[PDB]
Amino acid sequence: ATESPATRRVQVAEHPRLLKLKEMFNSKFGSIPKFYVRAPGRVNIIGEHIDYCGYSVLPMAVEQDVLIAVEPVKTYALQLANTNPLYPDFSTSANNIDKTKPLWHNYFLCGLKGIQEHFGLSNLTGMNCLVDGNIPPSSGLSSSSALVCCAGLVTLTVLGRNLSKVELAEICAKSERYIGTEGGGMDQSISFLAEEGTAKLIEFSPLRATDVKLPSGAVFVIANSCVEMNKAATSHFNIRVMECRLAAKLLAKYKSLQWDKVLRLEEVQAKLGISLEEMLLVTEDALHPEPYNPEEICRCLGISLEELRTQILSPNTQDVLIFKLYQRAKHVYSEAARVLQFKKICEEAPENMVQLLGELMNQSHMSCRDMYECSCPELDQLVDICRKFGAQGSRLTGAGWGGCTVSMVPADKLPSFLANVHKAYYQKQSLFATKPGGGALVLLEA
Ligand SMILES: Nc1ncnc2c1ncn2[C@@H]1O[C@H](COP(=O)(O)OP(=O)(O)O)[C@@H](O)[C@H]1O
Ligand SMILES: CC(=O)N[C@H]1[C@@H](OP(=O)(O)O)O[C@H](CO)[C@H](O)[C@@H]1O
Ligand SMILES: [Cl-]
Ligand SMILES: [Mg+2]
Ligand code: NA
């Protein structure tokens, strides 16, 4: 709708975290914070690597979040600090993102920048901020987005301007891209739009969030592989985006569309008016399974190597020489269908629901592992263990190449799953049960 992030009264005393934030802020800046902002991380139940392709996804917010204590100031200076020494203090007074190197404060700046630009503001929003995030970083739980989103909300609030949760999501999804990742809007959308007690089907263009009621007899558990993967510091992520972009263009061309304008896999389907099942057949016909090379792509599209490199590919991807068009498209179209089916099942709630939902997750994991090639040994091993121990469904979550897994565990298997999994892979940080949490909020002291 037009609804904005809520502002809630809390008793600092009851929240070890805010108390701590409060006290450290005062010691750090000499004054108590005027307000706080929280933006949660999230677990994607199913629908991996498709948001940027324009397809609907099914995440839910987790409890872990990024919490920021704030104090507006008159100077046009931004002073940032973190409760974790791993993240150095930083200050700026700049009127106008390096993306030469991913320093933590640049994620905060992406968020601030999106907001200031949205309002055509040139000057820096003056403030003192102390950051505390408890989402395991670079683990597929969107710690980067929680930070960007929290920073955007902070900025908005300091500016005293208004934005709906939807616009916040839209703006943050584009601003995070200044860090250099060419991802989608799932993470930012769920961070602002989540509601406690329900997952959301997040659809794009236009952005809409729809409640999805999860199975009553099973519990979702996150288990971190503990292999860290920093999306902004590596090229893996963007290569996949490009492969999809290129696949979309070739598909369009093969179907005689105006491919030059095409950027996403979903557009092709949309333009053709066919079903996802049908898009798989088109894919099968239009894209050869063996990889594509730059020169071949260039000949197919009727463009130049230079056009490709500078006009289509991203800087961090201009020297890619192997494009797995077929596999990426196949993963995408099949995965977008799985999300739709998962939602349908949750709504109809058949008897064998957990089982069916579980199968969809397992199918998702194998497509990610085999077709999108975004899993890793540790993830595969953990997923096996989860299943061994009771998970009806288990798969990697978030971008992959390390990070977390998400398992759907029957209630009765819960206690044993946890102990067994722990014992098996880890010999509440890396392994913990979760449930659908609420979205980003503004906090004022009770
Ligand atoms: N609590 C935190 N404090 C400061 N920066 C953080 C925090 N959590 C995440 N970040 C930033 O986000 C980066 C991780 O982003 P990313 O690789 O996209 O992981 P994720 O899968 O969690 O979104 C970190 O390297 C750090 O720069
Ligand atoms: C800000 C960003 O790019 N996040 C993207 C990234 O998630 P994570 O950084 O693992 O949370 O990968 C997932 C894979 O489904 C989506 O593509 C999403 O849009
Ligand atoms: Cl850093
Ligand atoms: Mg991220
Ligand atoms: Na749409």
Domain boundaries, the chain: 6-212+435-446, 213-235+374-434, 236-373
Quote the ligand 2 centre to 26 CA distance (angstroms). Answer: 35
User: Which residues define the annotated binding site for ATP?
Assistant: 140, 142-143, 230-231
What are the pocket residues of ligand 2 if the criterion is a CB atom closer than 6 Å to any ligand atom? 44, 48-49, 51-52, 140, 142, 144-145, 176, 181, 183-184, 186-187, 231, 398-399
Question: If you compute the radius of gyration of the chain from its CA atoms, what whole number of angstroms results?
Answer: 22
Polymer length of the chain: 446
Quote the ligand 1 centre to 146 CA distance (angstroms). Answer: 8
Question: Helix 165-176 to helix 186-193 angle, to the nearest 10 degrees?
Answer: 150
Q: Which experimental method was this entry solved with?
A: X-ray
What is the C-alpha separation between 47 and 156, in angstroms, rounded? 31
Q: What is the CATH number of domain 6-212+435-446?
A: 3.30.230.10
Do residues 322 and 365 make contact, with C-beta atoms less than 8 angstroms apart? Answer: no
Quote the ligand 5 centre to 105 CA distance (angstroms). Answer: 33
Point out the ligand nearest to the CA of residue 137: 1
Do residues 218 and 392 make contact, with C-beta atoms less than 8 angstroms apart? Answer: yes
What is the C-alpha separation between 446 and 443, in angstroms, rounded? 9
Q: Which two tokens mark 160?
A: 């005293």
Resolution (A): 1.6
What is the C-alpha separation between 225 and 402, in angstroms, rounded? 6
What is the C-alpha separation between 150 and 144, in angstroms, rounded? 10
List of residues 6+ apart from 100 with CB closer than 8 A:
none
* Best CA proximity match to 207, nearest among 244, 245, 164, 162: 164
Name the strand (E) or helix (H) holding 168: helix 165-176
- Considering only the top CATH level, what class is 236-373? mainly alpha
- Going by DSSP bridges, is the β-strand pair 7-10/441-445 parallel, antiparallel, or unpaired? parallel
Active site residues: 187
List of residues 6+ apart from 53 with CB closer than 8 A:
184, 244, 248, 264, 265, 266, 332, 336
What is the C-alpha separation between 68 and 76, in angstroms, rounded? 19
- Residue list, CB under 5 A from ion ligand 3: 103-104
Q: Is 404 helix (H, G, I), strand (E, B) or coil?
A: strand
Longest dimension (CA), the chain: 66
What is the C-alpha separation between 225 and 244, in angstroms, rounded? 26
Within 10 angstroms of residue 121's Cβ, the number of other Cβ atoms is 14
Per CATH, which fold does 213-235+374-434 belong to?
A: Alpha-Beta Plaits (3.30.70)
Torsion of CA 106, 231, 207, 119, to 10 degrees: 10
Phi-psi region of 292 (alpha: psi -120 to 50; beta: other; left: phi over 0): beta
Do residues 117 and 407 make contact, with C-beta atoms less than 8 angstroms apart? Answer: no
**Ligand 1 pocket test, candidate residues 24, 143, 406, most atoms within 8 A of CB:** 143
Report the nearest atom of ligand 1 relative to the CA of 137: 22
Q: Which two tokens mark 14?
A: 């009851």
Quote the ligand 2 centre to 165 CA distance (angstroms). Answer: 19
What is the C-alpha separation between 215 and 349, in angstroms, rounded? 8
**Ligand 2 pocket test, candidate residues 172, 186, 205, 225, most atoms within 8 A of CB:** 186
Q: Is 318 helix (H, G, I), strand (E, B) or coil?
A: coil
Q: Is the CB of 159 under 6 A from ligand 1?
A: no
* Best CA proximity match to 397, nearest among 411, 389, 388, 407: 407
Burial class (CB in 10 A: 0-12, 13-18, 19+), 29: middle
Distances (CA, A) of 301 to 240, 295, 316, 318, 322: 19, 10, 22, 17, 16
Which residue type occupies 13?
A: A
Burial class (CB in 10 A: 0-12, 13-18, 19+), 256: exposed
Quote the ligand 4 centre to 174 CA distance (angstroms). Answer: 13
- Going by DSSP bridges, is the β-strand pair 127-133/78-82 parallel, antiparallel, or unpaired? parallel
Q: Is 21 helix (H, G, I), strand (E, B) or coil?
A: helix
Q: What is the DSSP letter of 75?
A: S
Report the nearest atom of ligand 1 relative to the CA of 233: 17
Q: What is the DSSP letter of 399?
A: T
Phi-psi region of 25 (alpha: psi -120 to 50; beta: other; left: phi over 0): alpha
Place of tokens 């009621």: 213
The beta strand positions in 106-156, using DSSP E, are 127-133
Name the strand (E) or helix (H) holding 24: helix 16-29
Q: Is 323 helix (H, G, I), strand (E, B) or coil?
A: strand
Report the nearest atom of ligand 2 relative to the CA of 148: 1
Q: Which two tokens mark 60?
A: 């839910």
What is the C-alpha separation between 125 and 123, in angstroms, rounded? 6
Q: Is 38 helix (H, G, I), strand (E, B) or coil?
A: strand
